[PDB]
Amino acid sequence: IPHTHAHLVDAFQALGIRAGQALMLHASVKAVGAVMGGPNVILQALMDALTPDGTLMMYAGWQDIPDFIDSLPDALKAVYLEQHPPFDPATARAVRENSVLAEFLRTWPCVHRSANPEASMVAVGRQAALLTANHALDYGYGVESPLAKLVAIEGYVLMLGAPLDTITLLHHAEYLAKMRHKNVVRYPCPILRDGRKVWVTVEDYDTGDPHDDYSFEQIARDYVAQGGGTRGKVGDADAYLFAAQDLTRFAVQWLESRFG
Amino acid sequence: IPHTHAHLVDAFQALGIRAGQALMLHASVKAVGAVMGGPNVILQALMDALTPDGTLMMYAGWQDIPDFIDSLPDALKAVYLEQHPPFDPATARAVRENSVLAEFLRTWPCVHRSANPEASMVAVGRQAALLTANHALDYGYGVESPLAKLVAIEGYVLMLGAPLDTITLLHHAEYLAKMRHKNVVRYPCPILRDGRKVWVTVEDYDTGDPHDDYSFEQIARDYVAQGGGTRGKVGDADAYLFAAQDLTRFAVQWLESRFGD
Amino acid sequence: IPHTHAHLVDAFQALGIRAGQALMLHASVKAVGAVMGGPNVILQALMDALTPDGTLMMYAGWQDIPDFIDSLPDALKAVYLEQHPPFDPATARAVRENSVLAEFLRTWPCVHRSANPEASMVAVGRQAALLTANHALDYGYGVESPLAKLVAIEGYVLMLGAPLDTITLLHHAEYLAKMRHKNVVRYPCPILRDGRKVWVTVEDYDTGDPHDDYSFEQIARDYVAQGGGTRGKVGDADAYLFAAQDLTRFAVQWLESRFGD
Amino acid sequence: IPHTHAHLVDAFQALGIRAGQALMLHASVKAVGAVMGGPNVILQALMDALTPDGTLMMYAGWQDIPDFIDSLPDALKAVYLEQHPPFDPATARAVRENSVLAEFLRTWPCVHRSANPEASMVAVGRQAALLTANHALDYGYGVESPLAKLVAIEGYVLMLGAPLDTITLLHHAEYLAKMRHKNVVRYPCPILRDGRKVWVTVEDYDTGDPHDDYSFEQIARDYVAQGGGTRGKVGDADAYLFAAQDLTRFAVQWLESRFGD
Ligand SMILES: CC(C)(COP(=O)(O)OP(=O)(O)OC[C@H]1O[C@@H](n2cnc3c(N)ncnc32)[C@H](O)[C@@H]1OP(=O)(O)O)[C@@H](O)C(=O)NCCC(=O)NCCS
Ligand SMILES: CC(C)(COP(=O)(O)OP(=O)(O)OC[C@H]1O[C@@H](n2cnc3c(N)ncnc32)[C@H](O)[C@@H]1OP(=O)(O)O)[C@@H](O)C(=O)NCCC(=O)NCCS
Ligand SMILES: CC(C)(COP(=O)(O)OP(=O)(O)OC[C@H]1O[C@@H](n2cnc3c(N)ncnc32)[C@H](O)[C@@H]1OP(=O)(O)O)[C@@H](O)C(=O)NCCC(=O)NCCS
Ligand SMILES: CC(C)(COP(=O)(O)OP(=O)(O)OC[C@H]1O[C@@H](n2cnc3c(N)ncnc32)[C@H](O)[C@@H]1OP(=O)(O)O)[C@@H](O)C(=O)NCCC(=O)NCCS
Ligand SMILES: CN[C@@H]1[C@@H](O)[C@@H](O[C@@H]2[C@@H](O)[C@H](O[C@H]3O[C@H]([C@@H](C)NC)CC[C@H]3N)[C@@H](N)C[C@H]2N)OC[C@]1(C)O
Ligand SMILES: CN[C@@H]1[C@@H](O)[C@@H](O[C@@H]2[C@@H](O)[C@H](O[C@H]3O[C@H]([C@@H](C)NC)CC[C@H]3N)[C@@H](N)C[C@H]2N)OC[C@]1(C)O
Ligand SMILES: CN[C@@H]1[C@@H](O)[C@@H](O[C@@H]2[C@@H](O)[C@H](O[C@H]3O[C@H]([C@@H](C)NC)CC[C@H]3N)[C@@H](N)C[C@H]2N)OC[C@]1(C)O
Ligand SMILES: CN[C@@H]1[C@@H](O)[C@@H](O[C@@H]2[C@@H](O)[C@H](O[C@H]3O[C@H]([C@@H](C)NC)CC[C@H]3N)[C@@H](N)C[C@H]2N)OC[C@]1(C)O
Structure with a gap:
């Protein structure tokens, strides 16, 4: 039997999802297993656990961003x-490797989308406009970002069969941390x-590689080992639920103690 | 018989105020009538309806800003x-005609205040720092202002016995609107x-007079007439609750249809 | 006896016109008096004084620009x-009040014309393409204008029997000047x-009236009184020759000292 | 015994330097040898050969430009x-490796300086304002640059005991050339x-290393070998005089023939 909407709602609630929370999702559709109605039902079940007073956000980005053109022949x-x-923002497709769920949420009714192309976030719910508003083009994981706002409103991060290395929130910890070199x-x-096309220069900290000898999975595993977050099953997927404030605080201290 | 804290909370909630909202207030204490505990209770009842996860903001400005000195003799x-x-920002008093409630909120615990003197906003609540941050000195009702941010996070405007021509948000609509003359x-x-006193020059659109043949009262009454916002009683005061995004959109289209390209 | 080509060249050189200069001309044909061969000879004599390595520019504008249509009934x-x-740009006639000489220069061989309709400039000579290039539609007397470039390459302005209140360069001084009201x-x-007709909206500073309590004639006469420029006769006309950089610097200071920060 | 002004003027003239030319100089003071009056006389002799109708320009740059700060620790x-x-521009010192003569010319009476910090040019003479005007911050050796204007007015480049690798004009040829990769x-x-400090991002083609397997000395040597320019002695220094128009044309074709797509 494929997993049902009701069983997914119940599993999200058992993990600790509560009405009114702001929640950022990282997911693997394959890890969840067959769902009756497809990946739409994963999103709808999560929204239902959050209720309309909660908010669901995902990292969409832009699959076709041409940030590589300096490496091409001049012609x-x-x-x-x-x-x-x-x-x-109306049509730019989500990065495929961010899960098809991010593209599903990007095209959901009443969705709001942040303006930073490379770092673009999509959200549905009570605080969706807040989270996605005034996303600065430069340093898109920094102070003027949906990640900063998720921390400020004490939101959460849900890993739904997604590897621990894919926690985008840790890029915000990199931004905050006093490190020797970035x-x-x-x-x-x-x-x-x-309404017209303009080419601009975007400045950011490198998000393709770490700024020192570390990995996000390393930080997250250390966080779990010291009692951080909650763990459970949702469908066939191993799930982790993290508080954004505590995880960010931990990750900043982790980075500064080792590389500051 | 003075209005109680509990009855004001109930009246705010009946109007449509909900937990978590970001709300800009324009008010008249006299219009509300006698409140048991004074105007502090108006602010506290509103903050209770909004909860600490909500935000309350007012336009404070600076009562003593010397922006007129170019009109004086050289001596x-x-x-x-x-x-x-x-x-x-720690001491600059709020403009008296912005209601004593603005000065009350300016001196409230955990208040945040925006840096633009003439356009200074004060706020208490979860998004108070967000709304008041990086308030540019030039064009203080424009893109880098708390009003722009209130629209962006889909906040609200509450008129609590205040005349409809006192909606400061409509100065942001003026900034956005493409008009034949500014x-x-x-x-x-x-x-x-x-930490040192410096004199700077501030550039802005004139906010002392309209840029063309209109008034803010006209825009607001037209908005209400076509079904915009909610109306109700709070104490003795006529109250209006507007969505900042929808009101700004309406006002920009209102101005551009009459004076636009 | 009509003025000859040779005598006009001599008069231009005596005034201070030199080979290689970039020169913007304001003129009255009537003030010069009868010329043997007509106004063509005024332009040719000036070009000869400038030589092909110099440049001659005039403000053409567009006589038939329909910038008034927003005032009309919808039908x-x-x-x-x-x-x-x-x-x-191939056919748009120069503003008649800019002198017929501007229309004569607009239709001169090897002319270049700037793209801003209301502020369009025409030029012949070595720097004609440079002066007229990339003339932005918005703020046509501002940073992206032929007037800005004339200042930047330290060109000159020649008033050939033209009243001092017609110095278009002073609209560039208005643009540069930090003033209390614009x-x-x-x-x-x-x-x-x-290749297709498209209606656009142009934004600019008002050039139909001053932005404050001043006149262009007032500024220029003050400039002359403090030793600015050179004066002489060309034909029957009172002539003034101004350095564009020095006049612009003076005019910006003049405006800012009276209406500035 | 030290070289005199009169002999240096004649030596410049013997090379082909003529009245009215626009000339960009690259130099080594040591290569010229002892001059009676010091390096000022090198500049003054060159200006005298060019006359006030000519123009002298040098690449000054900015000795203290902090373009390296991303390489430093974050703190x-x-x-x-x-x-x-x-x-x-009033005080920024010229790059020392551009010769002390560039700093001497930067502080010369009636000097003009272009606005691009890294690529800043200084010039004295009839077309000094033109050459240094409107120097774009991005792509400072490209279309909106003093090098483009030097080509347009058919100027010259003088190497005065300077290595052929130091011909800044060839960076303009690199900009123009359709090469496989830059x-x-x-x-x-x-x-x-x-009047306030602002940090901006500047975009340019790399000028610290070639874009492919070539050197400027290689291009210049090939130009001389096929009959380009004139060569002679000025003081103790080997001197080369190149026409900017012909050298740029040659260098673009040279680069496109070997490294084009
Ligand atoms: C990379 C990663 C997404 C791959 O996991 P995945 O389960 O294989 O891929 P998705 O989550 O995109 O789901 C893909 C499945 O959705 C299924 N699906 C169901 N309905 C579908 C529909 N209408 N359209 C498309 N696919 C559909 C498909 O079967 C598809 O599998 P298939 O293409 O192989 O047949 C995952 O390992 C991961 O890292 N998730 C976290 C990603 C993240 O958040 N990154 C942030 C930046 S680091
Ligand atoms: C102008 C306007 C404020 C006048 O309304 P008002 O009720 O008479 O004035 P206030 O709201 O400031 O309240 C004043 C009353 O607060 C009362 N009050 C209670 N406790 C008080 C205290 N500790 N200290 C001072 N006043 C107190 C006073 O009785 C005072 O009345 P009084 O001075 O005549 O005795 C109102 O019409 C209005 O326009 N409000 C909107 C203003 C706005 O937001 N403008 C934005 C810029 S356009
Ligand atoms: C308004 C102003 C141009 C009037 O001066 P003017 O000498 O009477 O007018 P013009 O310079 O255009 O010369 C007109 C004369 O050229 C004569 N002329 C000679 N040949 C001619 C020809 N082929 N075609 C038309 N006119 C010719 C005509 O006699 C004509 O006079 P007319 O039409 O009354 O018979 C002058 O006072 C002025 O202000 N000049 C400066 C204008 C300026 O630069 N403005 C900038 C914007 S503020
Ligand atoms: C690098 C290069 C400048 C070195 O040549 P150089 O003759 O050794 O150096 P300069 O031309 O700056 O002249 C320096 C000499 O000026 C002399 N001099 C005379 N009066 C002087 C004075 N008031 N102040 C300073 N130096 C003075 C000094 O003796 C000084 O030598 P010293 O400091 O060792 O005692 C030269 O090889 C070169 O490349 N020139 C072309 C540079 C160029 O144009 N680059 C463009 C960017 S690629
Ligand atoms: C397409 N351009 C990308 C740019 O978008 C940028 O995207 C990064 C993206 O590369 C980065 O993903 C990395 O981290 C993922 C995870 C395994 N952490 C190591 C796997 C993909 C891996 N590249 C994301 N966590 C953050 C995102 N901003 O990275 C550099 C780049 C190659 O120029
Ligand atoms: C007593 N009559 C009042 C009338 O004065 C009226 O005055 C205020 C009026 O005083 C107020 O004007 C102030 O604000 C203007 C602007 C510079 N604010 C930034 C300039 C004039 C300044 N006095 C307006 N913004 C709002 C308006 N409601 O208020 C309502 C009323 C009952 O008609
Ligand atoms: C008021 N005195 C008149 C006047 O017409 C005057 O004409 C023009 C005057 O007509 C001209 O203004 C016209 O052009 C203005 C617009 C077309 N651009 C500046 C609007 C006003 C309009 N009258 C001014 N730019 C310059 C002025 N010299 O000439 C002197 C006179 C005949 O005595
Ligand atoms: C201070 N930053 C510089 C930058 O200004 C820029 O400087 C180059 C500069 O490197 C280049 O000069 C090089 O080529 C010359 C060499 C062939 N000596 C004969 C002079 C010394 C050497 N620095 C100049 N031709 C052009 C100049 N724009 O590029 C390198 C850099 C390290 O980023």
Whole structure:
């Protein structure tokens, strides 16, 4: 029997999902196993556990972001500058490796989407506009980000069969932590400004590689080992539920003690 | 018989105030009528309806801002440049005509205050720091303002016995609207920079008069007439509750249809 | 006896016109008096004094720009939107009040014309393409204007029997000057885009009236009184020759000292 | 015994330097040998050969540009962002490796300086304002640069005992050439905006290393070998005089023939 909407709602509640929470989801559809109605039901069951007074957010990004054009031959780069479409939040597809669930949520009714193309977040619920508002283009995991706001309202992160290395919130901890050196990247990106395409330069800390000798899975496993978070099964998937404030505090101290 | 805290909470909730909302208040204490405990209880009852997870914001400004000194004779202007105190957010009193409630909220525990002297906003609650942060000195009702942020996080405006022409949010609608004519002003203002008094020039759209043949009362009454917002009684006061996003959208379209491209 | 080409060249050189200069001209044909060969000879004599390594520029504008249509009733405005021709730089006639000499220069061999319809400049000579390039539609007397470039390359302004209140360069001084009050306008204009007529909205500082209590004649006469420029006769005309950089610097200071920060 | 002004003027003239030319100089003071009056006389002799109708330009840059701060520990970078002064064209010292002569010319009477900090050019003479005007911050050796204008006005480049690898004009040829790949750099820089320090991001082609398997000395040697330019002695220094137009054309074709796509 495929997992039902009711059984998923109940499993989310048993894990500790409560009405009114703000929750960021990382997921693997395959890890959950067959669901009666497909991945829509995962999202709807989670929303139902949160109720309309809660909020569900996912990292969408932009699957087709042309941030690599400086590596191309000059003639090809010029074609990209002329012909590549800009980031349009109405149509820009979510990064496939962020789970199809992120693309499902991006196209959900009443969804709100943040403006930073590379770091774009999507959310549905009471605080969806708040979480996604005024997402700065530079340092998209920093102070002016949905991650900062998730911490401020004491939200949560749910890992639903997703590897612990994929906790996007830890990029916000990297931003906050006083470390000896962080790598800064500057890359071009087309956006919409006054309804017209404009290429801008985006500045950020490197999010493709760590700034020192560490991994996100290492931080998260250390957090779990010292009693952090709650663990349970949802469908066939191993699930972890973390408080964003405590995990961020732990991760900053973890990074500063080792690399500060 | 003075209105009680409990009855004000009930009246706010009946109007549509809910836990977690971000709310900008315009008020008249006299319109509410006698409250048991005074105007403090109006603020506390509203904060209780919003809960600590909600936010209450008011326009404080600066009662003593010397933005008029260019109109004075040179000798008097010289004294102002030498002797007028700078905007200190810890002490700068709220504009009296913004209601004594704005000054009451400005001095409330855990308050946050925005840095733009003329346009300074004060807020208490979960999003108080967010709303008041990085308030640019130029164009204080524009893109880098608490009003823009209130719209972005889909907050609300509550008129508590206040006239409809006192909706400060409509100055943000003026900023957004593409209009045939706008007045731009530059005026001096003393501020604190690294703990020292410095005189800077602030540039803004004129907020002392409309940019064309309209009034804020016209826009607000037209909004209400077409079903915008909710109306109800709080104490003795007529109250209006507006969604900031919907009101701003309406006002921008209202201005652009009459004076736009 | 009409003034000859040779005598006009000599008069221009005596005034201080030199080979290689970039020169913006304001003129009255009547003030110069009868010229042997007509106004063509005024332009050719000036170009000869400048040599091909110099540049001559005039403000052409567009005599038929329909920037007033927002004031019309909707039915009449609709006809203008459908039927009024767009700004075509090949055919758009210069503003008649800018002197027929501006229209003469607009249709001169090897002329370059800037793209801003209301503020369009025409130029012939070594720096004609440079001066007229990339003239932005918004703020046509501002940073992206031929007037800004004339200042930047330290060109000159020649008043050839033209009243001192017609110095278009002073609109660039207004743009630069930090003043207590500025009027910003938006107006419609049809242009060519990919060979098709398109209506756009242009934003600019108001150039129909000053932004404060001053006149262009007032500024220029003050400049002359303190030793600015050189004066002389060209034909029958009173002539003034100003350095664009020094006049702009003076005018910005003049405006800011009276209406500035 | 030390070289005199009169002999240096003649030596420059013998090379082909003529009245009215626009000339960019690269130099080694040591290569010229002892001059009666010091390096000032090198500059003055060159200006005299060019006459006041000519123009002399050098690449000054900024000796203290902090374009390296991303390589520093984060705590040190924060100090630079707070404490490092901005590029002030009045005081920013020329890059020492650009010759002390560039710093001498930067502080010469009637000098003009372009606004791009890393690529800043200084010039004295009739077209000094033109050459240094509107120098874009991004792609400072490209279309909106003093090198583009030097080509447009048919200027010249003089190597005065300077290595052929130091021909800055060839960075403009790199910009123009359709090459298979060019390296783009983006770096921070403090500048002045409204009299205040502001950190901006500057984008440019890498000028610290070639974009492919070539050197500027290689290009220049090939140019000389096929008859380009003139060569002679000025003091003790080997000198080369190149036409900017022809050298740029040659260098673009050279780069596209070997490294184009
Ligand atoms: C990479 C990762 C997503 C892969 O997990 P996955 O379960 O294999 O992939 P998804 O979650 O996208 O689900 C894919 C399945 O959805 C199924 N599915 C059901 N209905 C579908 C529909 N209408 N359309 C598309 N797919 C559908 C498909 O069967 C698909 O499997 P298939 O394409 O192999 O046939 C996962 O390991 C992971 O890392 N998740 C966390 C990702 C994250 O949050 N990253 C943040 C940035 S580090
Ligand atoms: C102008 C306006 C404030 C006048 O309304 P009001 O009720 O008369 O004035 P206030 O709201 O400031 O309340 C004043 C009353 O508070 C009472 N009060 C109670 N406790 C008080 C205390 N400790 N200290 C001072 N006053 C106190 C006083 O009785 C005072 O009345 P009084 O001074 O005449 O004796 C109102 O009409 C209005 O426009 N409100 C909206 C204002 C706004 O938000 N403007 C935004 C910019 S357009
Ligand atoms: C308004 C102003 C141009 C009037 O001066 P003016 O000498 O009477 O007018 P013009 O310079 O255009 O010369 C007109 C004369 O050129 C003569 N002319 C000679 N050949 C001509 C020809 N082929 N075609 C048309 N006119 C010719 C005509 O006699 C004509 O006079 P007329 O039409 O009355 O018969 C002058 O006072 C002025 O202000 N000049 C500065 C304008 C300016 O630069 N403004 C900038 C924007 S503020
Ligand atoms: C690097 C290079 C400048 C070195 O040449 P150089 O002759 O040794 O150095 P300079 O031209 O700066 O002249 C320095 C000499 O000026 C002399 N001098 C005379 N008066 C002087 C004065 N008031 N102040 C300072 N130096 C003075 C000094 O003797 C000094 O030598 P010293 O400091 O060792 O005692 C030269 O090889 C070169 O490359 N020139 C071209 C540079 C260029 O244009 N680069 C463009 C960017 S690639
Ligand atoms: C497409 N351009 C990407 C850019 O978007 C950027 O995306 C990173 C993205 O690469 C990064 O994912 C990394 O982390 C994932 C997880 C296993 N942590 C190691 C797997 C993919 C791996 N690249 C995300 N955690 C954060 C996201 N901002 O990374 C650098 C880049 C290659 O230029
Ligand atoms: C007593 N008659 C009042 C009338 O004065 C009226 O005055 C205030 C009026 O005083 C107030 O104006 C102030 O605000 C203007 C602007 C500069 N605020 C930033 C400039 C004038 C300044 N006095 C308006 N913003 C709001 C308006 N309601 O209020 C209602 C009323 C009952 O009609
Ligand atoms: C008021 N005195 C008149 C006047 O018409 C005057 O004409 C023009 C005057 O007409 C002209 O203004 C016209 O042009 C303005 C607009 C077309 N751009 C500036 C709007 C007002 C309009 N009258 C001014 N820019 C310059 C002025 N010299 O000439 C002197 C005179 C004939 O005595
Ligand atoms: C201070 N930052 C510099 C930057 O300004 C920039 O400097 C280059 C500079 O590196 C380059 O000069 C190099 O080539 C010359 C070499 C061939 N000597 C004969 C002079 C010394 C050497 N620095 C100049 N031709 C152009 C100049 N823009 O690039 C390198 C850099 C390290 O990022």
